Structures are given as structure tokens and as C-alpha cells.
Design an enzyme around this catalytic site. Structure first.
Site, PDB file in Angstrom:
ATOM      1  N   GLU A  98      29.598  32.121   1.638  1.00 43.51           N
ATOM      2  CA  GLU A  98      30.451  32.463   0.509  1.00 43.51           C
ATOM      3  C   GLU A  98      29.672  33.273  -0.512  1.00 43.51           C
ATOM      4  O   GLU A  98      28.451  33.262  -0.518  1.00 43.51           O
ATOM      5  CB  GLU A  98      30.925  31.193  -0.209  1.00 43.51           C
ATOM      6  CG  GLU A  98      31.470  30.111   0.665  1.00 43.51           C
ATOM      7  CD  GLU A  98      32.075  28.999  -0.150  1.00 43.51           C
ATOM      8  OE1 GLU A  98      33.264  28.697   0.037  1.00 43.51           O
ATOM      9  OE2 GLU A  98      31.365  28.438  -0.996  1.00 43.51           O
ATOM     10  N   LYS A  99      30.388  33.948  -1.405  1.00 41.71           N
ATOM     11  CA  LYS A  99      29.756  34.511  -2.588  1.00 41.71           C
ATOM     12  C   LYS A  99      29.183  33.348  -3.385  1.00 41.71           C
ATOM     13  O   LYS A  99      29.851  32.321  -3.540  1.00 41.71           O
ATOM     14  CB  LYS A  99      30.759  35.276  -3.450  1.00 41.71           C
ATOM     15  CG  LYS A  99      30.108  36.061  -4.597  1.00 41.71           C
ATOM     16  CD  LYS A  99      29.596  37.417  -4.098  1.00 41.71           C
ATOM     17  CE  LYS A  99      28.457  37.971  -4.959  1.00 41.71           C
ATOM     18  NZ  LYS A  99      28.221  39.428  -4.680  1.00 41.71           N
TER      19      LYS A  99
ATOM     20  N   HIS B  79      32.402  23.315 -12.909  1.00 41.08           N
ATOM     21  CA  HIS B  79      32.868  22.442 -11.828  1.00 41.08           C
ATOM     22  C   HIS B  79      34.094  21.614 -12.234  1.00 41.08           C
ATOM     23  O   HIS B  79      33.973  20.588 -12.913  1.00 41.08           O
ATOM     24  CB  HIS B  79      31.756  21.516 -11.338  1.00 41.08           C
ATOM     25  CG  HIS B  79      32.152  20.695 -10.150  1.00 41.08           C
ATOM     26  ND1 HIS B  79      31.586  20.867  -8.903  1.00 41.08           N
ATOM     27  CD2 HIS B  79      33.086  19.724 -10.010  1.00 41.08           C
ATOM     28  CE1 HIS B  79      32.146  20.026  -8.050  1.00 41.08           C
ATOM     29  NE2 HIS B  79      33.059  19.321  -8.698  1.00 41.08           N
TER      30      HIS B  79
ATOM     31  N   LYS C 283      25.873  15.468  -9.421  1.00 45.19           N
ATOM     32  CA  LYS C 283      26.608  15.265 -10.669  1.00 45.19           C
ATOM     33  C   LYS C 283      25.896  14.216 -11.523  1.00 45.19           C
ATOM     34  O   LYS C 283      25.334  13.278 -10.985  1.00 45.19           O
ATOM     35  CB  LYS C 283      28.040  14.814 -10.364  1.00 45.19           C
ATOM     36  CG  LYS C 283      28.873  15.827  -9.567  1.00 45.19           C
ATOM     37  CD  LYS C 283      30.035  15.162  -8.820  1.00 45.19           C
ATOM     38  CE  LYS C 283      31.117  16.173  -8.454  1.00 45.19           C
ATOM     39  NZ  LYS C 283      32.077  15.680  -7.417  1.00 45.19           N
TER      40      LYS C 283
ATOM     41  N   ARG D  97      38.054  11.053   0.102  1.00 44.76           N
ATOM     42  CA  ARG D  97      37.606   9.723  -0.251  1.00 44.76           C
ATOM     43  C   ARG D  97      37.678   9.529  -1.763  1.00 44.76           C
ATOM     44  O   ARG D  97      37.860  10.491  -2.512  1.00 44.76           O
ATOM     45  CB  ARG D  97      36.167   9.527   0.231  1.00 44.76           C
ATOM     46  CG  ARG D  97      35.229  10.668  -0.139  1.00 44.76           C
ATOM     47  CD  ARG D  97      33.798  10.291   0.130  1.00 44.76           C
ATOM     48  NE  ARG D  97      32.870  11.375  -0.182  1.00 44.76           N
ATOM     49  CZ  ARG D  97      32.450  11.684  -1.402  1.00 44.76           C
ATOM     50  NH1 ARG D  97      32.879  10.989  -2.438  1.00 44.76           N
ATOM     51  NH2 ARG D  97      31.597  12.694  -1.583  1.00 44.76           N
TER      52      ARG D  97
END
Ligand SMILES: Nc1ncnc2c1ncn2[C@@H]1O[C@H](COP(=O)(O)OP(=O)(O)NP(=O)(O)O)[C@@H](O)[C@H]1O
Ligand SMILES: Nc1ncnc2c1ncn2[C@@H]1O[C@H](COP(=O)(O)OP(=O)(O)NP(=O)(O)O)[C@@H](O)[C@H]1O
Ligand SMILES: [Cl-]
Ligand SMILES: [Cl-]
Ligand SMILES: [Mg+2]
Ligand SMILES: [Mg+2]
Ligand SMILES: [Mg+2]
Ligand SMILES: [Mg+2]
Lengths: 447, 448
Positions: free
Chosen positions: B198-199, B206, B235, B291
Site C-alpha cells: 500500500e501507499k 487512526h 496503541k 474480535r
């Protein structure tokens, strides 16, 4: 900018948390007995105020005022108990350029002489329990009034608090013996042996309305708390909203409470207590607590309003940030007062070191406590380990969640009343939601 | 009636709590290393699944299936990590007459081969990050696509999870080197060496959307979580709602998430992760997590919805008890992941016995932990002490209340990352609410 917390225990911790949320500096006080108290650790500074007995420490006004000015406080938060309903302390703060975080002394005076409070409510068109017009000077007119009202009667201290100076009389001989007993106890406890009389209500629910006023005459209510689960007058389990109340009665009672508070130009947080008579579904003003209460969190969860923060804000001069139409009670919350007592030994006090303290978390759960592992609750003040509050979308869910929460709460080294609350939540009469104040007395929840 | 929790730590505790709310009986499992684990105390029964390394305990499918049937469980909740995104274990449960608490294995297959997930999203009319169509055969094929996409690019394992098998290529030579390292790493980690490209989006936020579907075709979204505060890909601080997002984009991204979900007939709880590009204010689907996630509780506080109870409710054949019109995010929540690491030593891990543990309480506070006084966190698994969630009426209020809560959270005996979150909350940029995913990489919070 800086607030002295004139209390101890879990309410001191609670008020301290509210100050830090507003960037307010905190001064804790402690007695010699409370040297290890959590609130003294989480306060920005802590000061010994005198020896263990409350009379020389937490009720030592000159020392509290002295410390407050010495350290440069702008205000004093009394919490509940101790000096919270003391009109003279409130007046002395004002005279020190210290903001009493609470209502005015005039307000504390008016609602703090409970017979005068009643007369004020009749004049604000609030219903009150049928009774005497002010104090009785004699057993003689106590007997006269009681025959006019009809037995059973209840004799109550006008200067009264903490359940002291209250007696039911079911006949004249009881009224005669109980009069002198209560007068004695009241003079001793309060320096005021003035008694008034009411019809003793036998089938009712304890419904109380949270009010909050600002310094600009605006008063709102945050709905009701239901405190019918009571042992010996003292509250054990509180819930919001009331299981038995419809929206028209919530509205009618909330409106009565707001009329109450503004008849006395009430500022900051208070609670109107109502007797909700299950025989005819009518409510009666019983008294006002001119202070924050132990059970305030149940209201804060359903309403989303930080009541103690709001106390500080109102004291700092803020206008109310909600009008009545902004207030909604969402979901159902129930509070369990967990004490250091053994419900298997008729709530015998349980002193000692806490060897293991593990508070439950998860969805819906709020723990209010100053206890911690290796802490010893001093036996000279209280028995509160924690308040647990469960907030769920429905009552049955709160009950299920409460068992869940209560069932993993580890308090070892002392006995507590967690088992009592677990047993209550499994009781079908409780789950039905249909019962009155006598419920613990005419049942045996512990088996 | 009875559910086996195929996990450990705080999430097993979370799941067990949700089961008891529903009157459901609980079976904990534990590795040899996890004997003191709180989830084994609060469960109704606990069983050893095997030795400490996950490969023979928490990923031991034969043993997990044996205990679930031996004990007469109706379902298995896999939490997050371990077997949650393992399609083959979901199948196996289903073949053992065990309700996998989560989506179908078919759904786990579709959205768990990430390049195929992408292709499914284009058919679903959901925007995706520009890149190759499917896997790249060769370093040669990577070179050609990367020239077509334009550098910088990111090579990503299609069977990738836990942030392994992902690296940026800023030029040809890096791409030649990255391709081979990532193919090897993804083979080892996942038994699948296939990469897609991907780029590499450099200025973004986010934004991930919570989805829940039931067994009757109903799919709702519970708004967004902003997980932009990350450290090496992982995160750290999450909040709901995103501070930089208006309700028209909230609707757009929620509707995008809902289309994605029902495109794969998705049942139970999932999260659709978007890249929100701050250069043009455009969102792109990056992946689905099939999930529950670590950060679910910040959504639960803003929405009032018990998501893990809802997973169980959905798995017992309940119709979604919420409609989309009835879902409101109220106020603002921030979750702080508190780990056993020393932030004053570049987050060096801090093994040891916890000698004092004091969880704060009060208004707006919610603690998620399996830790306790005298507990020792084993250095073999995901190193959490607690999640702390603060929910206030406004973001500024949440920030103030979180400093309050974090400042009295006592954890002695190990170093924790509490001091990092207090420094974060006193940072003016963080407070402005304006930053992107490289915030902690361009800033040095610990000097503040
Ligand atoms: N007229 C009445 N009939 C029946 N019960 C009553 C009556 N008045 C008081 N009680 C009971 O006695 C309790 C205490 O009364 P209250 O007038 O609240 O006293 P207090 O000493 O001010 N307590 P507090 O609530 O701590 O301020 C009430 O909660 C009722 O359970
Ligand atoms: N196209 C991209 N451009 C820039 N950064 C990216 C891109 N794709 C992924 N990342 C970063 O890499 C992280 C991990 O990618 P992701 O596709 O979520 O892998 P994962 O291994 O499935 N992780 P998980 O979320 O735990 O399942 C993201 O959260 C981004 O911070
Ligand atoms: Cl009280
Ligand atoms: Cl996760
Ligand atoms: Mg009173
Ligand atoms: Mg009272
Ligand atoms: Mg993933
Ligand atoms: Mg991801």
C-alpha cells in the site's frame, strides 16, 4: 484555588478528587488516630488537628479555622457529618473570609431546627407529616397532641442528626417514658432538648430528592434516591431511580423539593427527604439534609453530573451549568454500603488490620473507599470499608451485575457486610422491588 | 449456560465478569506460569492447559477443546489475541458443537486474509488504501507496483496480526531489503509468507469504528475510537469520540463500517480500522479486527453499552437490543494502557513482584486489571498492569480527571508507564487535540 477538607475517611478522599479535577489545591486534616488515612496521602498537604476523639479533632473549630487561614485556603468543605450542618461553624468561616463550601448559615439554621423547617415548608406549600406545631414544652401537651394526632406517634429532637433523639410511642405510657429519655439524650447530644412530635408512619418508602442551588437563585433537582433498605434507621442500600415511582410522581416530588430549597434561598447541594406513604401514595416532607450525602454517587451515575465538583463550582461563584430540562436519569444504579461488621453475628463490629483488599472493576462498577491493604480502620469513628455502586441499563441487570461485583470483592483480615448484600440481591422480595422500610425487620435475610 | 474463556490476564477477567452478569458459568484455563492469575480465582472452575509458552498452553487447541467438552461448556470466548482470529479454531469449535463467541469462521477467513479483505471492501463500495491487487509474486513485482504507487510504500503480511510482518520502504533498495525480511518473518510467524503493498500514509489519524452484528442480519456501529497515540505501531492512549471529527464524517465512517460488516454477513463484535488522512481529510479502510479489542471500554462508557455481554447475548441468539437511532456517544472517554515498563528508561520492561497496588476510584473512573498486591506479572505474555478509563462530559474535563486518577494510582515494586500518561496529559499539543500517529516520534514527552 485552595480548599481545606474538614473531614476524614472516604468523603475526604472524594472531595480531594473533586478539587484536583478543578485544579484546586487541597489541605487535609487528621486526628492522632487517623495518621495512616489515605486522604492525608493524596492531599497536597496534611495537618494534625488534635487527638482521636472527634470533639478535640474534627469538631475542633478554632484549630480547623486556624489551619485554614494559616495555609491560605479560600474555602472549607465539611463533607457529611462533623461540622456540615453546624450553622455556627458556617458563620465563623464567613467571618474569616473563608468560603464555606455549602449553603448559608441562615439556611443551615432554618432547616437545622427541624420543627422550624416544617413550619417553613407549610408556608412554601410543601406537604409535611401531621404533627405538633413546634416544640412541646411538657409531656402534658405531648400527651394532648398525641391523642389529637392518634397513636402511634414519633417524638423527635429538633436539633437532631445521626438518628439520635428519636423515639416511637405506641401508647400514652410509652410517650410519657420516651419523652424524658429523648429530651435527656438530645440535650446531651446537641445542647437542645427541644422535641417535636409527628404521626409515626408505618408503611412507607424513603424517597429523597437531590437539589442543587447556585448563588444566583437558580435551583434544580437531579431526581430521587430510594433508601428504603435500612437497618435501625441507618441506610444500607440506595438506588436511583426508585423502582416503585412513575414519572408524574418523580416530577411532583422534584418540584416540591425545588420549592423547599428556594423558600430558604438554598445554595449549593442539599437533599429533601420524603416519606412516601404506601397506604395512599402521598409524600410528606420529613427533613432536609443541608449537605452532600453518603449516597450521592448513585445519582451521579444515573444523571452523569459530578455533584461534589458542582459543589466547588457553585462555591467559586459559577451559575448552574444545567437547567431542569437538561437533567435526565439514565439506567439504574444501586449503592451498597460495605461496613466492617459481621452479618452472621447480627452485624457485630469487626476491628482489625485489612490483610487483603482487592476492589472489583469492569463495566458499571464504581468503588468509593479510603481502605487499602494493611490499613486498619480505627474503631472510634465509623465502620465504612467501601461504597460499591453498580450502574446498568435496567434494575434486574444492576442486581445481576452487583452480585458479580460483590462476589469478587476481597476484604480479608476483617469481617464485612458483603455477604449481607449478596444475600439481599438474591432475595425475591427485594427483586420484586415491592417492600417498605420495615423490610429487614420483618424478614431474616441472613437465613 | 456455561462458557470457556480461551484467554488470560485482564481480558479473561473482563469476559468472566460479563458471563456472571448473564448468569453464565465460567471455565478458566491457565498455563503453568499463570498459576496466581486472578481470572483463575474468579472463574467457577480453572484448569491447566499446559506449559508456560503459549504454543503449548493458550494456543493448544486439542487441550482447549478437550476441557470445553469435558466440562460441558456451550461456548468458547477467545478474547483478543491467541485464537480470536484463528478461522480454523472457530471451525473446530463449530464441529465440536461449541459456540465460538464471535463471527463465523468464513467471516474470519474473508477479513483475516488482509489482501482479500481489501478486495471485498472495494466490491462493498468501501474506500481502501491504494496498492496492489492481491499479493506480490516477487521482489520484481514489488518494484513495479512501488513505482506505480509511488514511494513511500509499506509492505504488509496478508495473514499478518499483532503488527508483525510490516515495514516501510522509502526507496528501491529498502524495498528489495524489506520484501525478503517481511516474507521470512510472516512465514515464520503465520505460516503464510504472502505480502501486499500500500501507499505508506504519513500524515494521518487512526480512526476505528466499532461494529456489532447479530444472527438476524442486524448490524450497528457504536461510533469511533481515536487510537492515534501509538508507540512502535502499538496503541497506548485511546479516546472516544475522536477530538478532530465532526458528526457528518462520523456518520460517513459509521455507514462505511456498517456496509463492510454486512458485506461479509458479519456476526457479533468487530472493529473496522480506518486511516484518516489529514492532508485531504479522506478515510481509507486499512483492516478489520474480527474480535473485541483491548480498547473496547472507552466506547462502552461513551455509549453505555456492555459490548462483551453483547457478544454473549449475540452468541446465544439474541436480536440486537439496540437500534442505530438509539445509539448516542455521550461525553468523552480516554483509556490509558498502563504497562510494566520504565518510561524514564525508554520503556525498558520492569519485571518483579508488585508490593503495593492501589486502584483509584471516584467519579468517571473505571479500572481494568488482573493485578493485585504480591502478584508477579510473568514476563512471557502481553505486559499490562491495568487499563484506566476516565469518562467526563468534555475532553478538557477528562484530561483533568485523568491526571487526578493517574496521580493517585499506586503500583510499587515494579516501574510502570503511569508517569508517561501524566506527562502526556500535561502536554500542550496533546491538549490541543491536533496531532497525527507520529506524535510520540516527533515529540519527547518524558523531558517535559
Ligand atoms: N414521622 C416518621 N414516621 C416514621 N419514621 C420516621 C419518621 N420520622 C423519622 N423516621 C425514621 O427515622 C429516620 C431518621 O429520621 P430523620 O428525621 O432523618 O433523623 P436524622 O437524625 O436527622 N437523620 P439524618 O438523616 O442522618 O439527618 C428516618 O430515616 C425514618 O426511617
Ligand atoms: N498504509 C499504511 N500507511 C501507514 N501506516 C500504516 C499503513 N498500514 C498500517 N499502518 C500502521 O501499522 C499499524 C499496523 O497495521 P495493521 O494493518 O493494523 O496490522 P495488524 O498486524 O493487523 N495489527 P492489529 O491491529 O493488532 O491487528 C497501523 O495501526 C498503522 O499505524
Ligand atoms: Cl449522609
Ligand atoms: Cl486488541
Ligand atoms: Mg437530619
Ligand atoms: Mg434523614
Ligand atoms: Mg490486525
Ligand atoms: Mg490494526
Amino acid at each position: 484555588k485552595k480548599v481545606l477538607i474538614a473531614n476524614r475517611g472516604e468523603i475526604a478522599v472524594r472531595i480531594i478528587r473533586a478539587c484536583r479535577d478543578l485544579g484546586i489545591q487541597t489541605v487535609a486534616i487528621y486526628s492522632e488516630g487517623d495518621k495512616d488515612a489515605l486522604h492525608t496521602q493524596i492531599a497536597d498537604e496534611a495537618y494534625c488537628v488534635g487527638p482521636t476523639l472527634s470533639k478535640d479533632s474534627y469538631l475542633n473549630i478554632p484549630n480547623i479555622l486556624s489551619i485554614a487561614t494559616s495555609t491560605g485556603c479560600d474555602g472549607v468543605h465539611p463533607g457529611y457529618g462533623f461540622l456540615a450542618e453546624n450553622a455556627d461553624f458556617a458563620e465563623l468561616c464567613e467571618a474569616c473570609q473563608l468560603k464555606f463550601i455549602g449553603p448559608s448559615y441562615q439556611s443551615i439554621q432554618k432547616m437545622g431546627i427541624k420543627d422550624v423547617a416544617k413550619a417553613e415548608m407549610i408556608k412554601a406549600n410543601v406537604p409535611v407529616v401531621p404533627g405538633s406545631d413546634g416544640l412541646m414544652k411538657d409531656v402534658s401537651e405531648a400527651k394532648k397532641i398525641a391523642k389529637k394526632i392518634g397513636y402511634p406517634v414519633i417524638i423527635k429532637a429538633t436539633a437532631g442528626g445521626g438518628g439520635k433523639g428519636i423515639r416511637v410511642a405506641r401508647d400514652e405510657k410509652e410517650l410519657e417514658t420516651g419523652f424524658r429519655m429523648t429530651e435527656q439524650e438530645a440535650q446531651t447530644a446537641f445542647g437542645n432538648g427541644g422535641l417535636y412530635m409527628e404521626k409515626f408512619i408505618e408503611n412507607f418508602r424513603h424517597i429523597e430528592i437531590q437539589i442543587v442551588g447556585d448563588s444566583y437563585g437558580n435551583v434544580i433537582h437531579l431526581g430521587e434516591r430510594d433508601c428504603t433498605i435500612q437497618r435501625r434507621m441507618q441506610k444500607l442500600v440506595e438506588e436511583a431511580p426508585s423502582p416503585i415511582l412513575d414519572d408524574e410522581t418523580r416530577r411532583e416530588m422534584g418540584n416540591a423539593a425545588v420549592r423547599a430549597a428556594k423558600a430558604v434561598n438554598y445554595e449549593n447541594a442539599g437533599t429533601i427527604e420524603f416519606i412516601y406513604d404506601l397506604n395512599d401514595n402521598k409524600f410528606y416532607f420529613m427533613e432536609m439534609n443541608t449537605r452532600i450525602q453518603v449516597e450521592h454517587p448513585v445519582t451521579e451515575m444515573v444523571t452523569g453530573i459530578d455533584l461534589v465538583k458542582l459543589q466547588l463550582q457553585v462555591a467559586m461563584g459559577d451559575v448552574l451549568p444545567y437547567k431542569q430540562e437538561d437533567i435526565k436519569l439514565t439506567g439504574h444504579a444501586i449503592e451498597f454500603r460495605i461496613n466492617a461488621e459481621n452479618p452472621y453475628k447480627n452485624f457485630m463490629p469487626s476491628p482489625g488490620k485489612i490483610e487483603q483488599y482487592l476492589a472489583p472493576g469492569g463495566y458499571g462498577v464504581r468503588i468509593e473507599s479510603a481502605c487499602y491493604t494493611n490499613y486498619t480502620i480505627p474503631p472510634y469513628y465509623d465502620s465504612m470499608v467501601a461504597k460499591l455502586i453498580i450502574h446498568e441499563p435496567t434494575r434486574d441487570e444492576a442486581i445481576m451485575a452487583g452480585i458479580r461485583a460483590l462476589s469478587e470483592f476481597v476484604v480479608l483480615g476483617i469481617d464485612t457486610t458483603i455477604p449481607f448484600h449478596i444475600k439481599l440481591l438474591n432475595n425475591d422480595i427485594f427483586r420484586s422491588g415491592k417492600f417498605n422500610t420495615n423490610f429487614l425487620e420483618q424478614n431474616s435475610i441472613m437465613n
